[PDB]
Design a protein around this ligand. Sequence first.
Ligand SMILES: COC[C@H]1CC[C@@H]2/C1=C\[C@]1(C)C(=C(C(C)C)[C@@H]3CCO[C@@H]31)[C@@H](O[C@H]1O[C@@H]3COC(C)(C)O[C@H]3[C@H](O)[C@H]1O)[C@H](O)[C@@H]2C
Ligand SMILES: COC[C@H]1CC[C@@H]2/C1=C\[C@]1(C)C(=C(C(C)C)[C@@H]3CCO[C@@H]31)[C@@H](O[C@H]1O[C@@H]3COC(C)(C)O[C@H]3[C@H](O)[C@H]1O)[C@H](O)[C@@H]2C
Ligand SMILES: [Cl-]
Ligand SMILES: [Cl-]
Ligand SMILES: [Mg+2]
Ligand SMILES: [Mg+2]
Ligand SMILES: [Mg+2]
Ligand SMILES: [Mg+2]
Ligand SMILES: [Mg+2]
Ligand SMILES: [Mg+2]
Lengths: 6, 6, 236, 236
Amino acid sequence: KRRKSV
Amino acid sequence: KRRKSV
Amino acid sequence: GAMGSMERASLIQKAKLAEQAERYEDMAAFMKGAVEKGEELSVEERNLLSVAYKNVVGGQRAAWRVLSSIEQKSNEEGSEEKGPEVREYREKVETELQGVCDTVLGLLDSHLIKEAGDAESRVFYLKMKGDYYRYLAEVATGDDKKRIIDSARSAYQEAMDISKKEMPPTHPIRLGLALNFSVFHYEIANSPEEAISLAKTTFDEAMADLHTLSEDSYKDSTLIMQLLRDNLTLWT
Amino acid sequence: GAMGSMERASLIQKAKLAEQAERYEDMAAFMKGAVEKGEELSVEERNLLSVAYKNVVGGQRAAWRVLSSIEQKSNEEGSEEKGPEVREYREKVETELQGVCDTVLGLLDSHLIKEAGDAESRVFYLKMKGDYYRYLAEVATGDDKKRIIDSARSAYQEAMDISKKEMPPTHPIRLGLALNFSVFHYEIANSPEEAISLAKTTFDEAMADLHTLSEDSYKDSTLIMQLLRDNLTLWT
Ligand SMILES: COC[C@H]1CC[C@@H]2/C1=C\[C@]1(C)C(=C(C(C)C)[C@@H]3CCO[C@@H]31)[C@@H](O[C@H]1O[C@@H]3COC(C)(C)O[C@H]3[C@H](O)[C@H]1O)[C@H](O)[C@@H]2C
Ligand SMILES: COC[C@H]1CC[C@@H]2/C1=C\[C@]1(C)C(=C(C(C)C)[C@@H]3CCO[C@@H]31)[C@@H](O[C@H]1O[C@@H]3COC(C)(C)O[C@H]3[C@H](O)[C@H]1O)[C@H](O)[C@@H]2C
Ligand SMILES: [Cl-]
Ligand SMILES: [Cl-]
Ligand SMILES: [Mg+2]
Ligand SMILES: [Mg+2]
Ligand SMILES: [Mg+2]
Ligand SMILES: [Mg+2]
Ligand SMILES: [Mg+2]
Ligand SMILES: [Mg+2]
C-alpha cells in the first residue's frame, strides 16, 4: 500500500 | 532454527 | 577520501560483502570510495552503488517518515507539548538523509554523469540524480523546495529523454526510471495524472516489447512492470 | 560526551523516537548519553538502553556471522584466493562490534553496575555485561578468548546468583538471563549439557510460579519461557 519505486 | 537469546 | 588507500577492486569486493552482510552504509561507503577512484563504473558497480545508497537512504527516509508523522501528530490540536525533541530528531534524521542525498548527488556530479556516455550508464545516473533530488524533495519545506523538485524533474526528464531514445521500452532502467519519475509526479510534483499516464504508457509500451526478450530479460522487465502495475492499482 | 549538552529527558525522549524509527544506533547513542548523565536508569530506561544496544550489536553480529561464514568458506580446500578483503571486512565489522560491546561494558562499568542496588537493576546490568562479553566471546579467537568467556560467565553467574536470591523464577529478567546464560553455555562455553539443564530448570521453575502472576505478568514470563522452550527443542 506504499507506492513502489525502485 | 537459530537459538534464542533475549 | 576515507577509501583512498583501498584498491578499487577491494572496495567493490567489500561493497559486495557488505551487501551480503546487509551492511548498506558500509556498502555505500565502499562504493563511494570506488566511485572516487575516478574510473567509470561498470554496470554491476553502478548497480552496487545504487543499491548501497538506495538502502541507506531508504532507511533514513523510512525513519524520517516515522518521525515526521510523529511530529505532525504533536502539532495536532489537543496534542500535549512535548518540547523540541521530535522536531530536533526529525531534523537530525533529515539532515543526515540530506547529507546522503548530497553525497550521492555529489558523486553523480563528480563525476559519474559527465563521464557516462552510454545510455545505460547515463540514464542510470540521471535516474539516481532524480531519485536523490526527489528524496531531498521529500523533506524539503523551504524556499528551495521548488528548485529541488525541478532538479529532480530535470534529471528524470533528461533520463527519460535519453532512455526513450536509446533504450528499449522494456529496459529495466527505463522502466525503473519511469516508475520513479511517475512516483515523483504523483507525490512530489502533485501531478497524479501525469504519474498515472506515465506509469500506464510505460507499462503498455513495455508489454508490447516483451516479445523481443529472452526469458531472463523478460523476468527483469516484468518485475518492474509489476511495480508500475502496483502503482497504477494503488493510484486508480 | 556527544550528548553532554542534551537533557537527559530529551535523550530518553529521543531514544524512544529513534526506537520507533528503528534507528537503533541513534537510540543507543541517546541512551549512552542518558547513561552518561550519571543518574541511575529507571526500568524503562534500562530497557531502552538494552534494546538500543541489543539491536545495534545484533546487526553487527549478524553481519559478522555472514562475513565470518564467507571467510571460512574462502579458507576451504579448493576455494579461490580472494585476497585479504573478506578477512579485512570481517575484521572491520568485528572491530566495530567489539567497540559497541566495549562501549556497553564501559557504560555498565561506568557506572551502571556499581550504582545498581536493586536486584532488577543489578541483574539486568549483569546480564547485559554477560551478553556483551558473550558477544565479544563470539568473535574472540585470541589469547583473551578464555578471559572474555569467563568475564561473560562471571557476569552471568553473579546475575544468576542475585536473580535466584532476589527474583521470582518467572521474572522476565531472570528468565532472559537464564536463557542467555544457557546460550552462553551452549555455544560459548561448549557446555551444551549445562545449557540444557539451565534452560530446563529455568523453564520448569518458571512454570511452577506462573500461578502467582497476573495475566500481564503471565504473558511476559511465558514469552521468555517460550524462548527457553525453543532452545530446549533446538538442542535436544
Ligand atoms: C538507478 O536506479 C537503478 C534501478 C533502476 C531499475 C533497476 C535498478 C536497480 C537495481 C540495481 C537492479 C534492480 C532489480 C530489478 C534486479 C534492483 C531494484 C533496485 O536496485 C536494484 C537492476 O538489476 C541488476 O541488479 C540486480 C542487483 O540485485 C540482484 C537481485 C542481485 O539482481 C541483479 C540483476 O540481475 C541486475 O540486472 C535493474 O537492472 C535496474 C538497473
Ligand atoms: C538485559 O537484558 C534485558 C532482557 C532480559 C529479559 C527482558 C529484557 C529485554 C527487554 C527490554 C524486554 C523484553 C520483552 C520480553 C518485552 C524485550 C526482549 C529483548 O529486549 C526487551 C523487557 O520487558 C520490558 O521492555 C519491553 C520493551 O519492548 C516492548 C515490546 C515495548 O515491551 C516492553 C515490556 O512491557 C517491558 O516489560 C523484559 O522485562 C526483560 C527486561
Ligand atoms: Cl536530535
Ligand atoms: Cl574493510
Ligand atoms: Mg560520506
Ligand atoms: Mg564514458
Ligand atoms: Mg540501445
Ligand atoms: Mg560511542
Ligand atoms: Mg542505586
Ligand atoms: Mg524480589
